[PDB]
Design a protein around this nucleic acid. Structure first.
Ligand SMILES: [Mg+2]
Ligand SMILES: [Mg+2]
Ligand SMILES: [Mg+2]
Ligand SMILES: [Zn+2]
Ligand SMILES: [Zn+2]
Ligand SMILES: [Zn+2]
Lengths: 110, 165, 246, 447, 166, 166, 110, 246
DNA sequence: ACGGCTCGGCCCGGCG
DNA sequence: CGCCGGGCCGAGCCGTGC
């Protein structure tokens, strides 16, 4: 099910979605995920600190928390260039030129 | 102890965009651009069909509950299982109002028609939407007759196009 | 980089408001001769167009022709802040912003963004109109206000030296009848008996904002749309096209 | 797999010659024949929220007036007094009140009612020792009843007799017919479903064409002239969630095309009357004027098919037939205790006695906001046909037959879940002159 | 932050005198009289009666009044203890509350004089109490809550809801 | 661990009933209120286990339902999912029959939903409406959390629950 | 605002010295709260040490576990200890079943 | 079949609106001497009597005595459309329709349906009134508007050459004292000190919309209903009888 | 799955 | 001095086969 206004970020076990990383951050581990802020910015800010999402593999449901050591999305710009946005300020600068999100980023699961 | 480190614990967006959108059409449109941008979503039909199972339940449920509803006085909160013959509250002078209005049925019909026309869904859902619109029009035949004409016709609607095919 | 100067910003605000009473988005087509507007409400029932040549404008300066799109709500909200004696100034630089300035006892400039709206050409060709009538704004305004008391529709009947407009309710009835010998009517030219009916809401929305010392011309035929006109500053013109009932 | 009975052709048997009979028939009632004048607002600036309420009130007023006019026919009811001017009456007089049943409850003394009419509400009590207590116990609200008793100035109308619109006990027999004529009833075909019994339907179509074993059945086939279908001829689109997996033909246009191709094989000497149902493309609430023409055009185009409404009345050789789908049987089944879908003939008699096809408002039946009530049985019929239950039954009550034609759809998952046993492929055969069922065909061997 | 379905600032019943918003101040300023079910406390010494835990005249703690349901005899707590909370003249168990009439003007004026808070525009209460005791709250706490813009919960606490993260 | 209020408010009452229709024996029944609907799967299954242990330690017999009881329970489980909530789990009818046949206590309660049932006037059951508390306990308790329940049985030295192990 | 209300209550209603004496939110550091879950009846005492600019409640995993919470979308309440001590009463609790949920009937101190 | 012509439709509109703030349905009687009126408040607390003799109307003609029953809301809506200088014409024919025609720059005609309403004729003769006083409309208007703030009940006190109006509340209080030397007090005639109280809402309804330069007569007694009457056009008059509160 | 969506009434400012 | 119209507040309601 999808409720109108609530986006779907990835298809089941589809390459290009969330990349699985094993670990536990300072502010994650109980049932929460670790997400780069760049992929929060580049999905039109639908994801904020504490926003819940319904997951597939480990359980059903998690809360997102910013982790700045994992990798971010890879995007395709409007002129044809391909860029790696692993930073927050870079995402803020680049957001308006994004044509397609090639890769979504990482997710740290305990 | 811990495995991964982070520079800041509260770095990033602080409020969801979903709380800054008013219209349902705007919400659907923004969600669809988001789904279109991501390479691994395949919005074009999948998100429509899955999303149409959130507006179709509302439409059909409201249409069903309209024909079996209870009325209530504005002054009181007493409810009547059958409309009073006088049209007014028997223990008041206050007027009787509905619990399921006519505008609560067709509030998502425009967005449903847009979702049907702009994307490729299975013929089943398209026919269900067309028949829902036809039934909504037909239920109010003797109460709200079409008494107003229009300058121009054919506003790129899909139901008549399917019928004429 | 065109400069526009208009005297009596209240009149401009009033015409912008009466154009905004029906449509929400519109685009202005301004050329060397003047500026023009035309659009249709989303119900596809009414059509309004507006022209404003160079004569009425006190100072006109424009290079080429340009299509500008402005949010009508914000436009009318900014225009409502003027006064009856201040001079309205419209300017647009290289940036896509419209500089609206008023010059009375002090100068205030408002920066308002430009928006893009798709422009569709929609012109209804001239149709055979069997009747024409010229009346004052006051009489038609009061007639609409009375017709709104009993029913949601108003009926027009045209005849030689007889122009009657009525409205019937479930039990009550109101009739307004007048002839050439009366005052409200200036002249009437009909070719055959005519009958039509139009919604009260649309008529009330369109006639609201007319001056008492104004001349309005109504052209309508048998079960066909109706056209209402009124000159603005002897040079402009307003066209209203309304679909009938039944 | 998308075959739609395109090549289903059955030819008349050149061994049985039909008897020439003049088709004397005429439609006596149709929903799209009463011109319902829409309502005028009390002023010139009304909105939607008031016209609907006024239309519903007008519908209930019309129902009450029509049922009161029907009630005031028997000589036994007399001295009618308005409920409003009830405090201006003595305590030793015989008075009657006619009104709508708001609600009823049960106590150790008896039953307490809330009869209401155009001029206010009143509370009525009926003692348990009354002779009509059994009859008045199995009554459902929104019906029109008449009471007789003494009014107390305390606030209770004590009653001693109960009335229903009912059916007259005596009637005049009609003149006999010259030659014998027969009619066949069908309902709930449900074209386009996986459970639709196509082989039995094909065998029945061959039976209509003269493929018959016994000589008496040869004569009956030679005497067949009319055929009536009581709705639910297609399985529909989107009736319930999860129906997509239940459909062989998931397209309403294709469903109607297949149904028309199936029905095209009837002999040219038979006239078909078809009505809509709750699964067809038609109005959501009853009464349904007709099908949606842009969807049911293939069945509209048939040479001998006549499209009627729900409900409709037909007059064949002076015999009136009241044809309805029967969505109101569920209300009687779910209220009165001791009534089940396996014996639908008794709720039919209950509806006939109350002279309404769908009294209860707010239950399992949707009611349209029409300004005039067309669900009141104005005239007494000779036969009554219904469907929607998928079980066969036939009873007689005071000289009128109450048939319920079976289905052509085998039991599906839902009826298995809720313990209903359908009886598909049963077809009643009636006699026009007698207006009674004379035989029951059973093609369930193949289905 | 957490608010009830209609926002509430004091757990005091107003009935219908307050209007749609259960505004106690509006009823007090309009001279309305309201009938509700509350618990009345009685001073043993002088005999004051009203929904207050302390007697204004002498500042001595009052005692709850127990009333018969059908019969209408009032017994203080000390006397009702001996009667096993059952009416002596009747055979029905007692109750601590009954339907009574109150005048919001006097109570609100007393509260305002008590806490020296006069410039408060609105003060919302409840239509009726849900407990079995129907003991009300002091109006001074409601005035201080309205002054500082904070709300109340079903048990008399101010709460703040937030999503939890580790 | 004495944190959640399942013991305080989930368990409405405890009563001793008689198996009149079969043998007129003595068994135990647990009345589940509305708040038990939000205690989690583990709290309800442990409640059933504790009820079984206490009934065995008090010298009481076991529940012996009739067929009508089973049909009523199946239609109640079917109805609640259709009309109230998704149940977060959908037990098959055969599982419901097995659980009803092999539970030594009566899982019952009051009425929490305004929906009428078909199998009416069942002996021992005093309501004709949906019992949300008991059916949710059955669906999301001993059934959904059977693994944890059998682990607790193994750790706890409790016999008589071999059917759940199978 | 809650602390200001508590100080006003202590100074005007009871005639006792004020407790918090705070003019900014940074003055609440070192003060105690109570954490309660929407399905339990026991609370736990916590201490304030800092603030963040997000819309979440950060705490130890033991703190969230002691309230029987899972931290994958759950939400809990917080209240100042002194306000609850002064204001809570068992005579305001509803009488139906469910009036004792969300009630600090007991608090854990360790 | 009567034809009644009236000038100054605004005054008629105000008169009917004042008559429409207490009752909704009542009957009008028409007779050679003029038009009468006597309705009753549904709350049975305030009585209104209105009399319009024939001399005030410009062209008043009628034969016999007839009764006319019209709902007050529709009538007030019809008469509210009139302007300051519109001629008001009341015409009735054989058909049971009440025609109201507004003559001016445009002849607009309204038709109203007559409704049958019962008439209860209760003639109340002179009652023993302790005090009779005459004051201007503005004084009583301002007094009522001031007293509306403090409470909802107003007290009247009439003494020897003294007229005092007072209202009391939980904490507020307002008083108004009137003497002979004041312009508002034209004259006073009292035999003994009298005092009573009434309701503000009814008092506000009866005094609202009262002309500034009007002499109003007040008669009342101890715990007795009050009599208020003011003349209109020096020929027609309106009588109010308000029962006291408690 | 439940906060998001329609109605109705009731004051409060401009505004002419 | 009398309206027109906004902006709050509080009610209700959200697939389903006989
Ligand atoms: Mg059916
Ligand atoms: Mg069917
Ligand atoms: Mg959780
Ligand atoms: Zn009422
Ligand atoms: Zn004392
Ligand atoms: Zn007693």
């Amino acid at each position: 099910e999808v409720i109108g206004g609530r986006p779907l970020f990835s298809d089941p076990s589809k390459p290009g979605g969330f990349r699985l990383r094993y670990g536990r951050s300072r502010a994650s581990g109980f049932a929460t995920w670790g997400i780069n802020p760049a992929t929060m910015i580049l999905v039109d800010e639908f994801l904020a600190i504490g926003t819940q999402l319904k997951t597939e593999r480990p359980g059903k449901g998690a809360v997102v928390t910013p982790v700045t050591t994992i990798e971010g999305p890879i995007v395709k710009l409007k002129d044809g260039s391909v860029l790696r946005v692993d930073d927050y300020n870079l995402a803020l600068k680049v957001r308006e030129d994004v044509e397609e999100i090639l890769y979504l980023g990482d997710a740290v699961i305990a | 102890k811990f495995t991964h480190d982070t520079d800041d614990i509260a770095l990033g967006p602080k409020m969801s965009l979903y709380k800054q959108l008013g219209d349902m059409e705007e919400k659907v449109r923004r969600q669809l651009e988001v789904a279109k941008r991501i390479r691994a979503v395949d919005e074009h039909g999948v998100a429509e069909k899955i999303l149409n199972s959130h507006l179709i339940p509302d439409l059909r449920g409201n249409l069903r509950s309209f024909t079996r509803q209870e009325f209530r006085c504005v002054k009181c909160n007493t409810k009547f299982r059958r409309p009073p013959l006088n049209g007014k509250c028997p223990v008041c002078g206050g007027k009787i109002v509905l619990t399921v209005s006519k505008g609560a049925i067709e509030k998502y019909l425009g967005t449903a028609k847009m979702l049907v026309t702009e994307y490729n869904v299975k013929n089943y859902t398209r026919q269900r939407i067309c028949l829902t619109e036809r039934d909504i029009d037909s239920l109010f035949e003797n109460v709200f007759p079409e008494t107003q004409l229009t300058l121009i016709v054919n506003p790129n609607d899909i139901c008549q196009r399917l019928v004429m095919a | 980089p065109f400069e526009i100067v208009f005297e009596g910003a209240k009149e401009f605000a009033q015409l912008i408001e009466t154009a905004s009473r029906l449509i929400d988005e519109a685009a202005f087509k301004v050329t060397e001769e003047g500026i023009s507007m035309r659009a249709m409400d989303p119900s596809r029932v009414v059509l309004i167009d507006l022209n404003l040549p160079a004569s009425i404008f006190s100072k006109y300066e424009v290079d080429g022709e340009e299509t500008i799109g402005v949010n009508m709500d914000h436009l009318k909200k900014v225009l409502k802040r003027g006064k009856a004696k201040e001079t309205l100034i419209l300017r647009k630089g290289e940036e896509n912003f419209l500089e609206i300035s008023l010059q009375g006892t002090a100068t205030r400039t408002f920066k308002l963004p430009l928006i893009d709206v798709e422009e569709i050409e929609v012109d209804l060709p001239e149709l055979p109109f069997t009747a024409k009538v010229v009346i004052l704004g006051d009489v038609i305004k009061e007639a609409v206000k009375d017709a709104s008391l009993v029913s949601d529709s108003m009926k027009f009947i045209a005849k030689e030296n007889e122009f009657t407009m009525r409205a019937e309710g479930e039990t009550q009835e109101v009739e307004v009848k007048l002839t050439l010998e009366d005052e409200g009517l200036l002249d009437i030219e009909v070719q055959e008996e005519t009958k039509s009916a139009y919604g009260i809401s649309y008529l009330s929305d369109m006639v609201k904002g007319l001056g008492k010392a104004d001349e309005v011309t109504i052209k309508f035929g048998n079960e066909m749309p109706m056209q209402m006109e009124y000159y603005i500053r002897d040079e402009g013109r307003l066209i209203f096209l309304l679909a009938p009932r039944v | 797999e998308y075959s739609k009975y395109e090549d289903v052709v059955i030819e008349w048997n050149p061994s049985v010659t039909p008897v020439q009979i003049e088709k004397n028939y005429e439609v006596k009632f149709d929903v799209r024949q009463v011109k319902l004048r829409p309502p005028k607002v009390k002023n010139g600036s009304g909105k939607e929220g008031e016209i609907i309420v006024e239309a519903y009130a007008s519908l209930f007023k019309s129902r009450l007036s029509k049922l009161k006019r029907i009630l005031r026919e028997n000589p036994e009811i007399s001295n009618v007094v308005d409920i409003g001017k009830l405090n201006y009456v003595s305590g030793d007089e015989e008075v009657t009140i006619i009104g709508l049943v708001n609600s009823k409850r049960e106590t150790n003394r008896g039953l307490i009612f809330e009869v209401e009419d155009k001029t206010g509400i009143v509370k009525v009590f009926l003692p348990k020792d009354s002779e009509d207590y059994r009859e008045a116990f199995k009554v459902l609200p929104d019906a029109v009843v008449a009471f007789k008793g003494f009014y107390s100035k305390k606030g209770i109308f004590f009653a001693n007799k109960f009335y229903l619109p009912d059916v007259p006990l005596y009637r005049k027999q009609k003149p006999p017919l010259e030659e014998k004529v027969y009619a066949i009833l069908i309902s709930d075909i449900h074209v386009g479903s996986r459970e639709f019994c196509e082989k039995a339907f094909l065998k029945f179509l061959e039976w209509l064409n003269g493929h018959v074993e016994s000589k008496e059945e040869e004569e009956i086939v030679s005497r067949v002239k009319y055929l009536i279908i009581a709705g639910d001829v297609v399985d529909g689109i989107g009736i319930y969630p999860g129906q997509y997996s239940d459909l062989v033909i998931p397209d309403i246009f294709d469903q109607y095309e297949a149904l028309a191709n199936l029905l095209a094989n009837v002999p040219e000497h038979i006239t078909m009357f078809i009505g809509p149902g709750n699964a067809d493309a038609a109005r959501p609430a009853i009464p349904q004027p007709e099908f949606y023409k842009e969807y049911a055009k293939p069945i509209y185009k048939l040479k001998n098919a006549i499209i009627i409404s729900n409900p409709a009345v037909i007059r064949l050789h002076g015999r009136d037939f009241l044809i309805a789908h029967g969505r109101g049987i569920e209300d009687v089944v779910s209220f009165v205790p001791g009534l089940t879908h396996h014996k639908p003939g008794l709720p039919m008699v209950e509806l006939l006695k109350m002279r309404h096809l769908a009294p209860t408002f707010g239950g399992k039946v949707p009611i349209a906001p029409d300004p005039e009530d067309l669900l009141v049985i104005e005239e007494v019929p000779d036969l009554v046909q219904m469907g929607h239950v998928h079980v066969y039954d036939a009873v007689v009550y005071r000289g009128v037959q109450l048939v319920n034609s079976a289905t052509w759809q085998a039991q599906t998952e839902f009826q298995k879940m809720v313990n209903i046993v359908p009886t598909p492929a049963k077809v009643p055969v009636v006699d026009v002159e007698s207006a009674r069922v004379v035989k029951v065909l059973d093609f369930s061997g193949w289905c | 932050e957490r608010k009830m379905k209609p926002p509430v600032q004091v757990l005091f019943p107003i009935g219908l005198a307050g209007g749609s918003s259960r505004d106690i101040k509006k009823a007090a300023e309009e001279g309305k009289v309201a009938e509700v079910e509350i618990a009345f406390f009685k001073c043993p010494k002088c005999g004051h009666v009203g929904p207050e835990h302390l007697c204004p005249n002498c500042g001595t703690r009052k005692e709850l009044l127990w009333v018969c349901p059908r019969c209408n005899a009032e017994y203080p707590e000390s006397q009702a203890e001996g009667y096993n909370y059952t009416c002596p003249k009747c055979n029905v168990k007692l109750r601590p509350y009954a339907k009574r009439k109150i005048r919001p003007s006097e109570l609100l004026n007393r509260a305002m004089e008590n806490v020296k808070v006069y410039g408060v525009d609105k003060l919302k209460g409840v239509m009726g109490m849900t407990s079995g005791w129907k003991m009300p709250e002091p109006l001074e706490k409601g005035l201080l809550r309205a002054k500082n813009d904070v709300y109340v919960f079903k048990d008399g606490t101010i709460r703040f809801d937030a999503t939890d993260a580790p | 661990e004495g944190i959640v209020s399942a013991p305080i408010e989930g368990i409405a009452n405890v009563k001793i009933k008689r198996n009149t229709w079969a043998d007129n024996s003595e068994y135990l029944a647990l009345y589940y209120a509305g708040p038990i609907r939000s205690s989690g799967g583990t709290a309800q299954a442990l409640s059933v286990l504790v009820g079984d242990y206490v009934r065995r330690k008090l010298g009481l017999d076991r529940f012996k339902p009739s067929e009508k009881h089973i049909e009523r329970m199946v239609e109640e489980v079917d109805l609640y999912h259709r009309a109230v909530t998704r149940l977060q789990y959908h037990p098959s009818p055969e599982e419901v029959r097995l659980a009803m046949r092999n539970i030594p206590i009566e899982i019952t309660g009051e009425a929490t939903d305004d929906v009428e049932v078909s199998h009416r006037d069942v002996p021992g059951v005093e309501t004709n409406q949906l019992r949300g508390g008991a059916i949710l306990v059955l669906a999301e308790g001993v059934l959904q959390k059977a693994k944890k329940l059998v682990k607790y049985i193994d750790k706890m030295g409790i016999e008589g629950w071999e059917w759940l192990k199978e | 605002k809650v602390a200001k209300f508590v100080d006003d209550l202590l100074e005007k209603f009871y005639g006792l010295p004020r407790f918090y004496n705070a003019e900014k939110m940074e003055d609440l550091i070192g003060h105690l709260v109570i954490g309660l879950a929407p399905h339990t009846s026991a609370g736990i005492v916590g201490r304030i040490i800092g603030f963040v600019d997000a819309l979440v409640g950060y705490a130890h995993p033991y703190f969230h576990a002691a309230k029987r919470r899972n931290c994958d979308g759950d939400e809990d309440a917080v209240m100042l200890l002194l306000d609850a001590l002064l204001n809570f009463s068992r005579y305001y609790l509803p009488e139906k079943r469910g009036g004792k949920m969300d009630a600090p009937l007991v608090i854990t101190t360790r």
